[PDB]
Symmetry: C3
Subunit: 274 residues, 3 copies
């Protein structure tokens, strides 16, 4: 949308000099518009096109700028109080709205405005940061975190204590992406624009960043940055040349199967009743 994209990459340029006071209602209204698009899935930080994921860097820019253009305001907690600049997504909703939007929100699950939550999802108590996208049928288990701009596919299981890297701090080039039908094991972490291809299964306590060797015991091939579709990954270590010690790595132990499928399936009864 040029009418927005234009006013946005304009200000980004002066990012360090804009402030909640010296900013022009022009740029203010836009960033506000661009944020509202993201909040509704109408727009999205990243997308797959021609079998390639592509980042809309300028939408990341709008997210960054929301922080320069808005001011902190006190939020009345019950027993305590908050002071921040990003509104609560679900604060205006009524039952009607929740009813039509079709996902479930378990307290005290929390979502920031500018994040997209699809139909038939379940948010156990967790966190969804600004500009992120969570597709249909997905579950975000307890204490899990969907980082700023992260892309979550359909029917994905993010187990408890799972973290999906953002792009705000530390600043990142690309968002983290989990393709459809992936299962992420408890307390695992996926960061730095790593891509998990669809139908993959990451075990518990597995940590993947750009420096993580993803080793295929079968091929002897070592990957970096992505998990080939349909893989089952678990933690391991590779040894030093002198065999003096070993360092962490992610090992692809096999391709997903019936046995694997029996342990990682989604529970439809937990989903929205039509």
């Amino acid at each position: 949308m040029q009418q927005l994209q234009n006013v946005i990459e304009s200000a980004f340029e002066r990012r360090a000099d804009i402030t909640p006071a010296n900013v022009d209602t022009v740029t203010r209204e836009a960033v506000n518009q661009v944020i509202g698009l993201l909040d509704s899935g109408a727009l999205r930080v990243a997308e797959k096109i021609d079998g390639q994921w592509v980042t809309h860097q300028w939408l990341k820019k709008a997210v960054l700028l929301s922080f320069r253009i808005n001011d902190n305001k006190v939020m009345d907690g019950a027993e305590t109080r908050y002071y921040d600049k990003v509104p609560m997504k679900f604060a205006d909703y009524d039952e009607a709205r929740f009813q039509k939007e079709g996902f479930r929100v378990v307290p005290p699950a929390t979502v920031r405005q500018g994040a997209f939550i699809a139909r038939n999802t379940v948010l156990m108590p967790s966190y969804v940061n600004i500009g992120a996208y969570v597709d249909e049928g997905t579950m975000v288990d307890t204490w899990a975190t969907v980082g700023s701009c992260a892309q979550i596919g359909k029917n994905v299981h993010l187990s408890g204590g799972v973290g999906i890297g953002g792009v705000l701090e530390p600043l990142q080039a690309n968002p983290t992406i989990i393709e459809d039908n992936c299962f992420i094991g408890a307390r695992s972490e996926v960061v730095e624009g790593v891509i998990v291809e669809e139908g993959s299964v990451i075990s518990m306590g597995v940590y993947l960043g750009q420096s993580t060797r993803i080793y295929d015991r079968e091929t002897g091939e070592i990957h970096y940055g992505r998990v080939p579709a349909g893989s089952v990954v678990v933690s391991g270590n590779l040894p030093s040349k002198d065999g003096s010690y070993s360092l962490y790595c992610a090992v692809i132990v096999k391709k997903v199967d019936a046995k694997t499928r029996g342990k990682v399936g989604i529970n439809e009864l937990l989903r929205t009743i039509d």
Copy 2:
């Protein structure tokens, strides 16, 4: 209790066809009764009998059915709002009740109805899911999670970020059980009906599921599914046949002792003052 057990395994059968509208007050009232029993420790998903743990599969069924029989309702958060079908355990309590019930609840700790919290326990901010049982003197540290139906013994220390596997999603046969006097290290995960025998000490960052080899460097014996009473467990790796790489495992490095005891003890001063 046949009068309940009967009406329950009846509906479970038609699980996918019951809904918050087409359900008969008969089945509704029961599931509601069976849930209230669990909420009070009067009933419990699993129990030890003749030195064996036994699952009451039909009580798991009632838990599953609570999700088909009830409807989501909006929950008024302070700064935000929720939409879910399982009530907050502590929402009706007054000081009187808390006073007699004898445990401590640190905000923003959250418990679902149908979960049993014993006397003299301490809940740092954490999560206790439906149908779970937490015995006396136990502490659940910050961001820890007690999964649906999990069984937690007396005087147990679940450190920060510790996760205890549930049985809802992914669907499990047996609950996860931690026997009395066990200490679980920070950020560790115990899932898939694995049993931790009493007085055991699991270090930090240890992950145990049914596929996890629990290795005894002493005996050379490898366990699966349970931690022998009085063990001290830490993370390790076992090597491949060709020595080309190594995979994660849980190593039993020793039996608990004075040295160990000095690091994992409970702090009575933190407990309820009589």
Copy 3:
């Protein structure tokens, strides 16, 4: 401050016999004063002097005693309720105060009274326990935990799901300390009075306690209890004498550099706008 220090080590002595009812307003008022000092950074559990960190054991004592001298009171959550004895730090604040105090508090971030939060910090939803100190420019990412009495330096990045060991349960001699300009990777844990020297980078899923070997592949030197300033640490394993298995350890793979710096930097735009 002798006038306080005196009345404090007096009662600590009778710790198990004091109670919220049999305690003298003298000792009550003090502990209350000593707690208020800590809440304001005026006092602090530990400090560096002559290039050595030193614990004020008697201030730890006051923290312990706050638990014997105060009584639990019900806290009104919105949808639920709490029962605890330590007040919410930010419950009395108004915008004016937040404005002058200069940090940001993202809901549902929670801080206990008696904890020091510096200027220009950012608390994503997380936990800061009593008696802890968080210095300037620091960020505490989502679901992170700053344990009781822990010391956090300036410009530190505690990533998501990171845990910093406390001293309450299990009872500890010294607090955990993170020096200035340190970066802690996602889901990592630092406990038992271990010290991380300034400008160090700990990767993801790294767990450090007193029994953790911190191995320097370069020197062959093994550390215990501290991370030498400017180190980059990642998980690994060291092998058994018979090569029968391997056990977890923290490996110092290199000294921090430009490459490293590009991945772990702070985002000023996220900080307080002057």
